Structures are given as C-alpha cells and as structure tokens.
C-alpha cells in the first residue's frame, strides 16, 4: 500500500556560485537569487577597509548563494497498518517423491 511520505537527498551537485558584498554603513548585501527556492545562501559580516577598496574600517555585509541540485535520493514511504499479506505454502507427503522437494 506504499504511499510516499518523505524523500531525502544524500548526494548533491552545486552550480552558479556568486557573492555580493557591501561596504559598512551602506546597508545589506543582495543577490537576485537569494530568495530562490532552489538556491542555498548565507549572510555574514566580513572585515572591510582601505585594503578592500572601501572608505571606512568596519564590518561589511556579504551574501553568497549557489544553485542546489539533487543527484541521488532516498524515499521513506508509509506502511498502512492492517494492510499486510502473508504467503504460506503447504505440501503433502506419501505420494510425493523428493523431486517434489
């Protein structure tokens, strides 16, 4: 009676890695795919200053994303209770010879 319940991915592929960075006091970093369902992202605060081509010495906002693709997946499905099926075999002696084993 097998109804699929939930599937897990155990091997994946990554593609289209990109990052967007912001100087301090210029707000939050932004990528157009950061709100995409198929993309995985992470925001962080990096050190920025004159070495990085920025006017002030402070914590800059950095977001990076990439597209996630599942390569191989496993599936957990439902066992409907009260929906089993046993199979039994019965064999009778006397007339039979062991070719019937």
């Amino acid at each position, epitope marked *: 009676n097998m109804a699929e319940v939930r599937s897990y991915c155990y091997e994946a592929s990554i593609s289209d890695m990109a990052s967007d960075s912001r100087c301090p006091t210029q707000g*939050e970093a*932004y*990528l*157009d795919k950061q*709100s995409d369902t198929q993309y995985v992202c992470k925001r962080t605060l990096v050190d920025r200053g004159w070495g990085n081509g920025c006017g002030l010495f402070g914590k800059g906002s950095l977001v990076t994303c990439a597209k996630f693709a599942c390569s191989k997946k496993m599936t957990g499905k439902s066992i409907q209770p009260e929906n089993l099926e046993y199979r039994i075999m019965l064999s009778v002696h006397g007339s039979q010879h062991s070719g019937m084993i």
Partner: antibody
Amino acid sequence: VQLVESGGGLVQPGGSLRLSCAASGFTFSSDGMSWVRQAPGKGLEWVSYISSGGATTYYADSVKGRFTISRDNSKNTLSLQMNSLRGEDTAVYYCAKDITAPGRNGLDSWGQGVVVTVSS
Amino acid sequence: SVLTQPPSLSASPGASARLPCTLSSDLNVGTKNMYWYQQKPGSAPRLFLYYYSDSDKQLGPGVPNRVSGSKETSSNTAFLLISGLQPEDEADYYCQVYDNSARVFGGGTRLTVLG
C-alpha cells in the same frame, strides 16, 4: 487583470495630489504594488513600492519624504499621496503589480496611467 | 548603479534584433534578473521578458517565441533578441534590474522596423 488609475489633473507648485488605482482580475492582497512615472518624452523611473501586507514601503530618493504609498486590501485599491509637488513631478504615473515569486520579481501588469501636471 | 542603452536602433523585417543594456561595474550581469518592458506609442509599458539565463526565463503574456535573451560577462551586458522581425515589434524597450529596494531602468532603446 485590470489596473485603472484615477485622481490626477492639474496641480500647482507646492500643492498635493492623491492617486488611486482599482485592481481586479487577481488576488490583490497577495501581491506587492509599485508606482512608476514617465515624464513627457523621457523614459521610465520607479517612484515607490509597497508590499502585499503593507508592512514594507520604499521610495525613490527624488520622492522620499514627499510621497506616501498606501493600500486597502479589503477594497483592492492602491494609493499614492504626493505632497510638495514641483515641476519635476509632471509625468504620467503608472500603477503596476510588483510581484514576488520563487527567485523572481517584476512589473507583471501595468495600468494605462494618469496625467499629473505641475505648473504655476 | 547605471543602466546604459542606445537611444535608438533600426532593422528590417525578418531580422534578428539585438538590443544591448550595459550594466555598470556596480553590479555584475551574470547575477542579475533582467526585466524588459515594451512600450508602444499611446500605451503603457508591458512586461516583455524576464531573463536570468537560458534555463531561468519567462516570456510576457502574448509575447511570441521569437523573443529571447542573453548575457555576456566580459562586457557586463544584457541582450534582448527578437528573431524574424515584424512591424508590430517596433516599440520602445527598457531594461530593468532590482537592487535592494532600488528599481533601476535603462535609458530605453527605440526600435524601428524599417518599411
């Protein structure tokens, strides 16, 4: 999908106008909306955005502090309050669906716009 | 953030139209959602094409298959493509990007189908 604007006309510098747009053909309360202006003979420039629920509003630097965008999701109406109007604000004002989708945005549908003329 | 388009372009019917939109080094074209809007004289703009890549795109309602998009990272440019040009395709076209509450429009290209 129907976007019908109204509430425009001739205003004088330092006055105020209040634009209204009735929306139909879609679930209005589930989409963000934006106003876009186009001066006579020139290109397009975004004015202001408001989210579906109204919690978040954004304004262009040329309009900040002077304009205010509003929603009435029960009446399916988008409002744009314009204060301290100057001669730069003379343009056609378009009402547009500013949607949010999985990894996708955009001005899907536009109204035909209303004329706003600021002159002394 | 500046979007740069040529003021005007022209071609004959049956042509493969190619309309550029230069992104300033502020952003990078490869990571941008591209929204093209078509506006014919006397009418409002309509959403013509959404384009992130050849695998992430959508044509506007009633926009034929001949309309396509592309990018080139070397020149930080986006392109609007119209195969087999037709008189009805003569219009004004604007590229547009989103950037953290900022909606930036290009100058706009006025496409002219020659007749």
